[PDB]
């Protein structure tokens, strides 16, 4: 247990704590301006001149003194209450507030021994911010206390709420930009309080950093009337409190006392809500939220060159852009830095004075040190059930290609028993699609957690106020809740209809970038569990929906995060349920990855045994010798290769026909896509030798690909024999139609694959047969048109091994 969770003070905040908070605020404002402006001379020792100012002024002052003031008060709160706490910096461009926090709490020097607590360390701390060879502009993963960089705005609240799930002792004050609040993801984020339980989950306190402005505009929320603003948050299930400071001549000490008192009233109400939830965990309370309204750029000069800067969008980036170039800008910088009175905050050796930090929390309650902000320190391996009990044994008993199994059903039974073994640290998310993607075997041991109105057992099923599945119709919520759940040391999976995964393409990008920085250069930030995404209800079988739901191209996005041997991204094609089981075990064991697991949910053949899936997954691509009819590679007229359940089914049917014509070929299945890249681009891929062994040195290769052929063509550009691959993929053809028609219109059906194989071998010799196959595809289509269902010879085909 960290600290003493949800304890009230029962006395006023001490005047000593008010004094330290003002000193914190002044020292973090001062060091924040130092990080932005100063390359040397951090204490302004004589001579202090323009030569000390950075040549390239980059950074964001505007948000920063607001963050610094909140951080003083959140630090004071943590310490007085001993409260386990992670904050979220929505406006992550306020990096200097976050580095200053860690430098003051002592974690910066603990993690970065060269940045010491004295004048030399402070000079280095100022210079390195946003500087070549130094550190980033934002609250990046390399800053102690970050689980959220806030570079791409919008995810503050899904992360805050994912962090408190199953984390009942954790408090998360979540600082949200008022511009950030104009984004879609942030706006739906407010509703998460219907999806957490105040007894079994922790508590988020949204703090709206209502500073009036974004980059070059006021914000929507700051300019609506106060009655609308309060109604809005009340309507989303919060008790709104509002603080206003900085707009008049109120002295700073008075402002600190009034905020501290307010913040104690808010926390008292959170403690009452927590105590009450021990007895009534079914009534959803109105959680407090804080409207925090202060001038943007607070404490900077009011006017610069006749333009209002404090209390304006003009404070957003870098005031006094000429600080190095004109004595006029320099003098204003100098008076601004002096207004904090650093001579009272730093000792002669340049260390921050003891009376500046005596109010701060210590040890693992420090914001930089808490293990929830470095969740790999808390993470334990899942207790995984034995995979063998889930195997589809129909392949072993009856033959390759047996049965009509819905593949994700085996993964659902497996996830069911993972939750049973790990009952408060593995969660499932779904955007109203968990049952639709066939993961509902999980409801045998848990419920969809819903903390909002109930009506009747006639409609409410597999749903309770507490449980380990969470659904909301929002891919942004699902992805963001899960990320933070992982970042705080836990595990899970979510599932999505495949074309809708693109809603969160840019979230996958940010979390891949977080992983990239971390695996490269932040070894103190320990491995977290991987994002595991079941990508199902795919392009080939969107039976109730249509062309709008046909887009497997998240493959292509993910290919753009496969650099530097980072190995943070995996694309897997689950050929059947036994391959799906083998992939899922690997993904559930992996760390520091995004794993995209493609699988069809339609009734389909099972091709491999589980032991075969385990060996084939490890190689990445495998020959299916029991399907090939060629002696060796020299005897091969064509390589039949596929990735995806549907392309595989169709290729396999094509191989059966080609066998029957006396064509010689081998069958290669591809599961781990990126293992096709060259060793030069991927030091864990197939060696050129294993790759030639699979695909031959010079025979034609027909490659039936689940997604866009572009992907495979780009990946194998420097592989031996690449000029002989003919990649057939999805080509933006389809509609609401039968399963044969969907593969037909993309030249993916067995008949078109058989034809392409013939074309590659001898187009002249096979002209007539190709014609007959093209004509059969028209007959099969007409049959679907006339009759309402696909031609039996298509639907009824089973691989000859069964």
From the list 632, 650, 634, the residue with the least C-alpha distance to 642 is 650
Candidate segments 406-414, 421-429, 466-474, 659-667, binder of a second copy by CB under 8 A? 466-474
| Alpha carbon 364 to its chain's center | 26
Q: Does 717 bind a second copy (CB under 8 A)?
A: yes
Q: From the list a second copy, Mg ion, ligand TPP, none, which binds 137 (C-beta under 5 to 8 Å, kind-based)?
A: a second copy
Please say which residue, 345 or 415, places its beta carbon nearer to a second copy: 415
Residue 160 CB burial class (10 angstroms; 0-12, 13-18, ≥19) = buried
- Report whether 217 belongs to an annotated binding site: no
Q: Does 792 bind a second copy (CB under 8 A)?
A: no
SS (H, E, C) 515-582: HHHHHHHCCCCCCCECEEEEEECCCCCCCCCCHHHCCCCHHHHHHCCCCCCCCCEEEEECCCHHHHHH
Candidate segments 365-373, 414-422, 486-494, 705-713, binder of a second copy by CB under 8 A? 705-713
Q: From the list Mg ion, a second copy, ligand TPP, none, which binds 187 (C-beta under 5 to 8 Å, kind-based)?
A: a second copy
Own/partner long-range contacts of 446-451 (Cβ < 8 Å, ≥24 apart): 446/419, 449/195, 449/196, 449/197, 450/194, 450/195, 451/193, 451/194, 451/195, 451/196, 451/197, 451/284
Q: Does 505 bind a second copy (CB under 8 A)?
A: yes
- For residues 103-113, b (16+ Cβ closer than 10 Å) or e, as one string? bbbbbbbebbe
Please say which residue, 296 or 400, places its beta carbon nearer to a second copy: 296
Number of residues assigned to the chain = 802
Q: Does 706 bind a second copy (CB under 8 A)?
A: no
Please say which residue, 85 or 197, places its beta carbon nearer to a second copy: 197
Cβ atoms of residues 410 and 416 within 8 Å: no
Cβ atoms of residues 593 and 530 within 8 Å: yes
From the list 29, 196, 162, the residue with the least C-alpha distance to 96 is 29
Q: From the list ligand TPP, Mg ion, a second copy, none, which binds 334 (C-beta under 5 to 8 Å, kind-based)?
A: none
Cβ atoms of residues 312 and 63 within 8 Å: no
Please say which residue, 475 or 612, places its beta carbon nearer to a second copy: 475
Positive/negative CA dihedral, 457, 461, 464, 470 = negative
- Report whether 167 belongs to an annotated binding site: no
Please say which residue, 230 or 258, places its beta carbon nearer to a second copy: 230
Q: Which residues pair with 402 in a beta bridge?
A: 606
Candidate segments 14-22, 225-233, 391-399, 682-690, binder of a second copy by CB under 8 A? 225-233
Cβ atoms of residues 154 and 91 within 8 Å: no
- Report whether 93 belongs to an annotated binding site: yes
Candidate segments 211-219, 336-344, 663-671, 695-703, binder of a second copy by CB under 8 A? 211-219
- Report whether 781 belongs to an annotated binding site: no
Q: From the list a second copy, ligand TPP, Mg ion, none, which binds 233 (C-beta under 5 to 8 Å, kind-based)?
A: a second copy
**Binds a second copy (CB under 8 A): choice among 283, 347, 735, 774:** 735
β-sheet with 725-728: strand ranges across: 621-623, 665-670, 638-643, 701-705, 725-728
Q: From the list a second copy, ligand TPP, Mg ion, none, which binds 191 (C-beta under 5 to 8 Å, kind-based)?
A: a second copy
- DSSP string computed for 109-172: HHH-TTS-SSHHHHHHHHHHBT-TTSB-SS--TTSTT-S---SSTT-HHHHHHHHHTT-TT-EE
Q: From the list ligand TPP, a second copy, Mg ion, none, which binds 62 (C-beta under 5 to 8 Å, kind-based)?
A: ligand TPP
Cα 675 to Cα 643: distance, rounded to the nearest angstrom: 12
Cα 164 to Cα 278: distance, rounded to the nearest angstrom: 17
Q: Does 731 bind a second copy (CB under 8 A)?
A: yes
**Binds a second copy (CB under 8 A): choice among 551, 612, 656, 672:** 551
Grouping H, G, I as helix, E, B as strand and the rest as coil, residue 189 is helix
Please say which residue, 75 or 294, places its beta carbon nearer to ligand TPP: 294
Please say which residue, 356 or 715, places its beta carbon nearer to a second copy: 715
Q: Does 230 bind a second copy (CB under 8 A)?
A: yes
- Report whether 62 belongs to an annotated binding site: no
Q: From the list ligand TPP, Mg ion, a second copy, none, which binds 523 (C-beta under 5 to 8 Å, kind-based)?
A: none
Cα 359 to Cα 795: distance, rounded to the nearest angstrom: 73
Cα 572 to Cα 599: distance, rounded to the nearest angstrom: 9
Q: Does 233 bind a second copy (CB under 8 A)?
A: yes
Q: From the list ligand TPP, Mg ion, a second copy, none, which binds 321 (C-beta under 5 to 8 Å, kind-based)?
A: none
Q: Does 199 bind a second copy (CB under 8 A)?
A: no
Q: According to CB under 5 A, which residues from 131 to 190 bind Mg ion?
A: 177-179
**Binds a second copy (CB under 8 A): choice among 9, 384, 463, 619:** 463
Grouping H, G, I as helix, E, B as strand and the rest as coil, residue 53 is strand
Q: Residues 6 or more apart from 657 whose CB is under 8 A from it?
A: 750, 754
From the list 610, 576, 609, the residue with the least C-alpha distance to 395 is 609
Minimum Å distance from CB 306 to a second copy? 10
Q: According to CB under 8 A, which residues from 174 to 193 bind a second copy?
A: 179-180, 182-191
Candidate segments 468-476, 588-596, 629-637, 791-799, binder of a second copy by CB under 8 A? 468-476
Q: Does 294 bind Mg ion (CB under 5 A)?
A: no
Please say which residue, 114 or 452, places its beta carbon nearer to a second copy: 452
Q: Number of residues in contact with a second copy, rule: CB under 8 A?
A: 137
| Pairing status of strand 171-177 against strand 203-209 | parallel
Minimum Å distance from CB 222 to ligand TPP? 9
Q: Does 211 bind Mg ion (CB under 5 A)?
A: yes
Candidate segments 8-16, 509-517, 684-692, 793-801, binder of a second copy by CB under 8 A? 509-517
Q: From the list ligand TPP, a second copy, Mg ion, none, which binds 167 (C-beta under 5 to 8 Å, kind-based)?
A: none
Q: Residues 6 or more apart from 35 whose CB is under 8 A from it?
A: 59, 96, 99, 100, 125, 126, 129, 130
Cβ atoms of residues 307 and 314 within 8 Å: yes
Mark 384-403 with x for binding to a second copy (rule: CB under 8 A) and - for no binding.
--------------------
Residue 797 CB burial class (10 angstroms; 0-12, 13-18, ≥19) = middle
Please say which residue, 422 or 477, places its beta carbon nearer to a second copy: 477
Please say which residue, 73 or 744, places its beta carbon nearer to a second copy: 744
Q: Residues 6 or more apart from 531 whose CB is under 8 A from it?
A: 479, 482, 483, 486, 508, 511, 593, 594, 595
Q: Does 310 bind Mg ion (CB under 5 A)?
A: no
Grouping H, G, I as helix, E, B as strand and the rest as coil, residue 194 is helix
Q: Does 544 bind a second copy (CB under 8 A)?
A: yes
- Report whether 63 belongs to an annotated binding site: yes
Please say which residue, 178 or 451, places its beta carbon nearer to Mg ion: 178
From the list 492, 537, 483, 542, the residue with the least C-alpha distance to 514 is 483
Tell me which residue has its CB nearest to ligand TPP: 177
Please say which residue, 275 or 473, places its beta carbon nearer to a second copy: 473
Please say which residue, 61 or 267, places its beta carbon nearer to ligand TPP: 61
Candidate segments 210-218, 326-334, 666-674, 760-768, binder of Mg ion by CB under 5 A? 210-218
Q: Residues 6 or more apart from 535 whose CB is under 8 A from it?
A: 495, 496, 498, 501, 554, 596, 597, 598, 599
Residues forming the site for ligand TPP (CB under 6 A) = 62-63, 91, 93, 152-154, 177-180, 183, 209, 211, 213-215, 219, 296, 316, 431-432, 473, 497, 500, 503
Grouping H, G, I as helix, E, B as strand and the rest as coil, residue 427 is strand
Please say which residue, 178 or 585, places its beta carbon nearer to Mg ion: 178
Binding-site residues, in ranges, read 63, 93, 151, 153, 178-180, 211, 213, 296, 316, 500
Binding-site residues for Mg(2+), in ranges, read 178, 211, 213
Binding-site residues for thiamine diphosphate, in ranges, read 63, 93, 151, 153, 179-180, 211, 296, 316, 500
């Amino acid at each position: 247990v960290i600290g003493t969770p949800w304890q009230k003070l029962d006395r006023p905040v001490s005047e000593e704590a008010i004094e330290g908070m003002d000193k914190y605020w002044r020292v973090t404002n001062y060091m924040s301006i130092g990080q932005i402006y100063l390359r040397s001379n951090p204490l302004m020792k004589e001579p202090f001149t323009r030569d000390d100012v950075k040549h390239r002024l980059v950074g964001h002052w505007g948000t920063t003194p607001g963050l610094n003031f909140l951080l003083a008060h959140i630090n004071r709160l943590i310490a007085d209450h001993q409260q386990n706490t992670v904050f979220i910096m929505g406006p992550g461009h306020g990096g200097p507030a976050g580095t200053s926090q860690s430098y003051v709490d002592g974690t910066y020097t603990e993690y970065y021994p060269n940045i010491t607590k004295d004048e030399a360390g402070l000079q280095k701390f100022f210079r390195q911010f946003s500087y070549p060879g130094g550190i980033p502009s934002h609250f990046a993963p390399e800053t102690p206390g970050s689980i959220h960089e806030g570079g791409e705005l919008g995810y503050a609240l899904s992360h805050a709420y994912g962090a408190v799930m199953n984390n009942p002792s954790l408090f998360v004050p979540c600082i949200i930009g008022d511009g950030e609040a104009e984004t879609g993801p942030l706006a739906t984020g407010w509703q998460s309080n219907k999806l957490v339980n105040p007894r079994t989950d922790g508590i988020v306190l949204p703090i709206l950093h209502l500073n009036g402005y974004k980059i070059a505009n006021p914000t929507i929320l700051a300019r609506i009337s106060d009655e609308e603003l309060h109604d809005f948050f009340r309507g989303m299930g919060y008790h709104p409190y509002e603080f206003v400071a900085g707009f008049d001549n109120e002295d700073h000490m008075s402002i600190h006392r009034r905020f501290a008192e307010l913040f104690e009233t808010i926390f008292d109400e959170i403690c009452d809500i927590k105590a009450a939830a021990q007895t009534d965990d079914m009534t959803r309370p109105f959680y407090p939220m804080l409207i925090f309204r202060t001038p943007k750029g607070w404490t900077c000069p009011k006017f610069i060159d006749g333009k209002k800067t404090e209390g304006s969008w003009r404070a957003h980036q870098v005031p006094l852009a000429s600080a190095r170039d004109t004595e006029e800008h320099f003098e204003v910088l100098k008076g601004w830095m002096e207004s904090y009175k650093p001579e009272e905050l730093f000792n002669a050796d340049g260390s921050i004075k003891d009376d500046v930090t005596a109010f701060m929390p210590k040890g693992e309650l420090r914001i930089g040190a808490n293990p929830n902000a470095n969740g790999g320190v808390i993470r334990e391996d899942l207790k995984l059930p034995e995979l063998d009990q889930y195997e589809v044994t129909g392949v072993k008993e009856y033959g390759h290609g047996w049965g009509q199994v819905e593949a994700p059903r085996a993964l659902g039974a497996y996830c069911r028993d993972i939750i049973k073994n790990n009952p408060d640290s593995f969660r499932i998310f779904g955007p109203d699609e968990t049952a639709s993607n066939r993961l509902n075997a999980t409801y045998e041991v848990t419920d969809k957690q819903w903390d909002n109105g109930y009506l009747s057992g006639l409609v409410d099923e597999h749903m309770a106020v507490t449980g380990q599945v969470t659904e909301q119709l929002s891919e942004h919520q699902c992805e963001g809740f899960l990320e933070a759940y992982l970042l705080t040391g836990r595990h899970g999976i979510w599932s999505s209809y495949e074309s809708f995964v693109h809603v969160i393409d840019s979230m996958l990008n940010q979390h891949a970038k977080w992983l990239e920085a971390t695996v490269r250069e932040i070894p103190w930030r320990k491995p977290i569990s991987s994002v595991n995404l079941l990508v199902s209800s795919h392009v080939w079988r969107q039976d109730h929906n249509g062309f709008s739901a046909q887009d497997p191209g998240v493959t292509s996005l993910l290919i753009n995060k496969t650099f530097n041997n980072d190995h943070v991204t995996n694309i897997y094609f689950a050929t059947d349920a036994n391959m799906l089981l083998a992939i899922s075990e690997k993904c559930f064991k992996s760390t520091n990855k995004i794993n995209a697991i493609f699988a069809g949910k339609q009734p389909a053949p099972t091709w491999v045994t589980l032991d075969e899936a385990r060996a084939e997954l490890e190689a990445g691509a495998a020959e299916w010798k029991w399907a090939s009819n060629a002696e060796n590679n020299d005897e091969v007229q064509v390589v039949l290769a596929s990735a995806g359940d549907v392309p595989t089914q169709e290729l396999m049917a094509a191989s059966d026909a080609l066998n029957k014509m006396g064509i010689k070929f081998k069958v290669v299945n591809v599961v781990d896509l990126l293992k096709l890249q060259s060793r030069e681009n991927n030091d864990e891929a197939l060696t050129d030798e294993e790759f030639t062994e699979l695909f031959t040195a010079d025979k034609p290769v027909l490659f039936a690909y689940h997604s866009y052929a572009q992907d495979v063509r780009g990946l194998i550009y420097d592989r031996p024999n690449h000029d002989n691959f003919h990649v057939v993929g999805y080509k933006e053809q389809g509609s609401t139609t039968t399963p044969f028609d969907m593969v037909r219109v993309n030249d993916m059906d067995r008949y078109a694959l058989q034809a392409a194989a013939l074309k590659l071998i001898d187009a002249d010799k096979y002209a007539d047969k190709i014609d007959e196959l093209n004509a059969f595809r028209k007959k099969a289509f007409q049959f679907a048109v006339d009759n309402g269902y696909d031609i039996p010879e298509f639907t009824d085909w089973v691989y000859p091994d069964v």
